[PDB]
Amino acid sequence: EPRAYPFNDVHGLTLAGRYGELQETEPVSRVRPPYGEEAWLVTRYEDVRAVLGDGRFVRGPSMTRDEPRTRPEMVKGGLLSMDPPEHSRLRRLVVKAFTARRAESLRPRAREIAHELVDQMAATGQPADLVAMFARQLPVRVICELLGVPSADHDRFTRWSGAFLSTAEVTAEEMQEAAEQAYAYMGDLIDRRRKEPTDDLVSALVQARDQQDSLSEQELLDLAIGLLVAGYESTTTQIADFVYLLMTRPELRRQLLDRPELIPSAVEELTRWVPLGVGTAFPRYAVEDVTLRGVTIRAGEPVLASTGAANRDQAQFPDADRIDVDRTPNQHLGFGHGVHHCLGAPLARVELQVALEVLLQRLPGIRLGIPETQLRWSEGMLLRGPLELPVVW
Ligand SMILES: CC[C@H]1OC(=O)/C=C/[C@H](C)[C@@H](O[C@@H]2O[C@H](C)C[C@H](N(C)C)[C@H]2O)[C@@H](C)C[C@@H](C)C(=O)/C=C/C=C/[C@@H]1CO[C@@H]1O[C@H](C)[C@@H](O)[C@@H](OC)[C@H]1OC
Ligand code: HEM
């Protein structure tokens, strides 16, 4: 009676038709995931937003529950495993340092990196793999700039970081070795910065105070690694997916070449439209019985609040399946909602905007080097995107 879940096919960005049918007939429904417990699935924009904003729906039980999921291992902890007040405290300290102004201050460096990456692509000649040469490189290098990793260390830092991607084909031990290198490295960088602060985010996080409170040694380190993993694969996959869409929908590419000022609005529209998740990770747990759409979610039950379906809800977004780069209003949930609302979203916006800006400026004829039906899609089962994007220009 619960439906097998996920509904999305990983081999593309299509939004499963089941979502729409549930938004109509059964907006709070039961699902059976590949691993973990059966759960409620919530699919209407209004309800998804209500769930993510509601104090009765928490993340703490993640730590001691068999979470609905698509992979056998569970990845636990981070800010997203915490609830107020402990969550509020850490978030207050982080946002104090990681401000929208810091995010925008990185646009010039983000563009310089994007141009170097395009130089490297042009230097090896068509076809180049946009995924390996650009999408997997820009967001970790920008995180390097953000944190304060000295330039000479960007290559080894990038190399360790690649082992954390869900698409990586490394043994357990290899990934383990990259994880120890990155922790050790970040720990030392934090300690330098503490005694000799610069202008980078690690310096500002060490000096962040909130009515006499500060981040502990371990907190600093877990938060810095936490930003790395939250900010790398997401951004990488979304760059790949946006460019795949640009290269396969000529009217989208023509609109942005003609009017590059539309790039920020287009980033928002594609963040809405792309159901980036294979499913919905990060189940919330009811702290008490909650009745939603006349159905009672009981205390302790997991609830998957689908931002992919919510962002494509016809009740909230006129002609929701149309990509309209000027769409307004566009109050999408592509960066989340409520206390866990993506804290890197200003910088993600900067990076996505820069990626499209530089690629379009440098390679206005960029297009697929192989037929669309021949693309290989990631089977990492967390996010959807192409494994390789051979491009010509
Ligand atoms: C797709 C995005 C996520 O990717 C992930 O969740 C990454 C998952 C990969 C697939 C895992 O690696 C796999 O583990 C298996 C046991 C073996 C398998 N191989 C080697 C055959 C291997 O590929 C995990 C265990 C990798 C380790 C290094 C890890 O902790 C990765 C963390 C990355 C988390 C990524 C970011 O999500 C963040 O997860 C945190 C737990 C949350 O608190 C939150 O913010 C910090 C969230 O981002 C919003
Ligand atoms: C296109 C790129 C990105 C997308 C689509 C994205 C999306 C999201 C979403 C939907 C959430 C909320 C998850 C939930 O509530 O279940 C989230 C949380 C988070 N994101 Fe992002 N994100 C992106 C980039 C980034 C970047 C670049 C960073 C950091 C530099 C970042 C750091 C974080 C952190 C630390 C959280 C958890 C916040 C908390 O629990 O308080 N994200 N992101």
Ligand 1 neighbour 230 (Cβ under 6 A):
yes
Q: Is 73 in the pocket of ligand 1 (CB under 6 A)?
A: yes
3-class SS at 290? Answer: strand
d(CA 360, CA 246): 10
Answer whether 172 contacts ligand 1 (Cβ < 6 A): yes
* 163 sits in which H/E element: none
Task: Give the chain's largest Cα–Cα span.
Answer: 60
Q: Å resolution of this model?
A: 1.8
* Alpha-carbon separation of residue 263 from 191, 233, 355 (angstroms): 39, 22, 10
Atom nearest to 73 CA in ligand 1: 16
Atom of ligand 2 nearest to the CA of 91: 41
Which two tokens mark 293? 């759409």
Query: Residue 386 forms beta bridges with which residues?
Result: 377
**Quick one: which ligand is closest to 231's CA?**
2
Technique that determined the structure: X-ray
Phi-psi region of 126 (alpha: psi -120 to 50; beta: other; left: phi over 0): beta
* Distance between CA atoms of residues 12 and 9, nearest Å: 7
**Taking a C-beta distance cutoff of 8 angstroms, is the pair 257, 250 a contact?**
no
Strand 28-32 relative to strand 3-4, pairing: parallel
Q: How far is CA 266 from the centre of its chain?
A: 17
8 A C-beta contact, residue 57 and residue 286: yes
End-to-end distance of the chain based on CA atoms, in angstroms? Answer: 50
A 10 A CB-CB count for 328 gives: 9
CA-based R_g, the chain, Å: 21
**Whether residue 300 has its Cβ less than 6 Å from ligand 1:** no
Instruction: Indicate the SS3 state at residue 306.
Output: coil
CB of 90 within 6 A of ligand 1: the answer is no
Residues 357, 345 contacting (CB under 8 angstroms): no
Whether 13 contacts 245, CB under 8 Å: yes
Q: What DSSP assignment string belongs to 213-281?
A: EE--HHHHHHHHHHHHHHHSHHHHHHHHHHHHHHHH-HHHHHHHHH-GGGHHHHHHHHHHH---BSS--
C-alpha closest to that of 374 among 387, 361, 357, 392: 387
Eight-state DSSP code of residue 318: T
Spatial CA neighbour of 16 closest among 278, 249, 264, 205: 278
CA distance 39 to 68: 7
* Separation CA 86–CA 141 (nearest Å): 30
φ, ψ of residue 82 in degrees (nearest 5): -110, 155
Looking only at the bridges linking them, the beta strands covering 39-42 and 302-305 are parallel
Domain residue spans of the chain:
1-393
How far apart CA 382 and CA 168 sit, in angstroms, is: 13
Task: Give the closest residue to 346 by CA, choosing from 95, 148, 36.
Answer: 95
CA of 263 from ligand 2 middle (Å) equals 21
Two tokens at 217? 């040694």
Please tell me whether 340 is known to bind a ligand: yes
Q: Of all helices (H) and strands (E), which one includes residue 209?
A: strand 209-210
Q: Using N-to-C axis directions, what is the helix angle for 345-362 and 250-258, rounded to 10°?
A: 90
For residues 15 and 389, what is the distance between their CA atoms, to the nearest angstrom? Answer: 21
Residues found in the chain: 393
Q: State the amino acid at position 165 in one-letter form.
A: L
Find tokens 């905007």 and name the residue.
353
Residue 322: C-alpha distances to residues 7, 11, 20, 70, 319 (Å) = 21, 20, 14, 29, 6
Q: Is the Cβ atom of 229 under 6 angstroms away from ligand 1?
A: yes
Tokens 């690690």 correspond to 202
Instruction: Say if ligand 1 is within 6 A of residue 67 CB.
Output: no
Token couple for 126: 């068509």
What is the assigned CATH class of domain 1-393?
mainly alpha
Ligand 2: distance of its center to the CA of 251 in Å? Answer: 30
- Which residues contact residue 326 at a Cβ distance below 8 angstroms, ignoring those fewer than 6 apart? 262, 265, 269
Q: Which of 366, 393, 392, 387 is nearest to 375 (CA)?
A: 387
As a whole number of angstroms, the distance between CA 384 and CA 16 comes to 13
User: What residue owns the CA closest to ligand 2's atom 20?
Assistant: 342
In degrees rounded to 5, what are phi and psi of residue 391? -120, 150
Query: How far is residue 114's CA from residue 108's CA, in Å, rounded to a whole number?
Result: 10
Q: How many C-beta atoms lie closer than 10 Å to residue 183's C-beta?
A: 15
Closest CA to 336 of 345, 326, 327, 347: 345
Give the closest residue (by CA) to ligand 1 atom 7. 166
Q: What is the phi-psi region of residue 157: left when phi exceeds 0, alpha when psi lies from -120 to 50, beta otherwise?
A: alpha
